[PDB]
Amino acid sequence: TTQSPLNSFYATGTAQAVSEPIDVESHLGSITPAAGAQGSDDIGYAIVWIKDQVNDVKLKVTLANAEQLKPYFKYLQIQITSGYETNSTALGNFSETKAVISLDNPSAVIVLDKEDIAVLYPDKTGYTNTSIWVPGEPDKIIVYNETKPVAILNFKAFYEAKEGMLFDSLPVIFNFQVLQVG
């Protein structure tokens, strides 16, 4: 009569990847020395949000406009440190200098692992009503009573202005490139 092939059984699911692994928002500052002066100053920070089930990040940070900056600076070095402060006392404070880039070595590889990524768990003992803020600046709160894996990169500059050069508004541009994610 009818000979079934015994194949007409199926089960189906779906998959998606709708977001990039990281988001970067910048809060950098300015370098305002006199002509030919030597100094150092904190630039600011850059928030690196971490997305769904991302645990380790490998980045490459580059001084994109290093060639443009050369005729205005005798030397210019940017030091990037990963760190944050919190009231959690179960997560703790962190500080980790990761790279030093300059006009001669504009690129550097940075790795962010479990300690570089700060996470709060509001439904646990240690994370009752705890915040996360930029190191040394308690008024700039990043995360408050919610689970948002975040990394904070703090920028500090060491510079030598060129003798007699007067300039007004040239930008300092940093580019981030994701290399590996897990």
User: Rounded distance, CA 50 to CA 56, Å?
Assistant: 9
Residue 129 CB, nearest approach to Ca ion (Å): 28
Are the CB atoms for 109 and 79 separated by under 8 Å? no
Interactions with a second copy, residue window 51-90 (CB under 8 A): 53, 55-56, 64-65, 68-69, 72, 75, 77, 79
Interactions with a second copy, residue window 98-137 (CB under 8 A): 98-100, 108-111, 113-115
Place of tokens 């981030």: 176
Q: How many residues bind a second copy (CB under 8 A)?
A: 75
Question: Strand, helix or coil at 52?
Answer: coil
**Cβ neighbours of residue 164 closer than 8 Å, sequence gap 6 or more:** 35, 36
36 binding partner (options a second copy, Ca ion, none; Cβ < 5 to 8 Å by kind)? Ca ion
Beta partners for 23?
49
141 binding partner (options a second copy, Ca ion, none; Cβ < 5 to 8 Å by kind)? none
Interactions with a second copy, residue window 134-153 (CB under 8 A): none
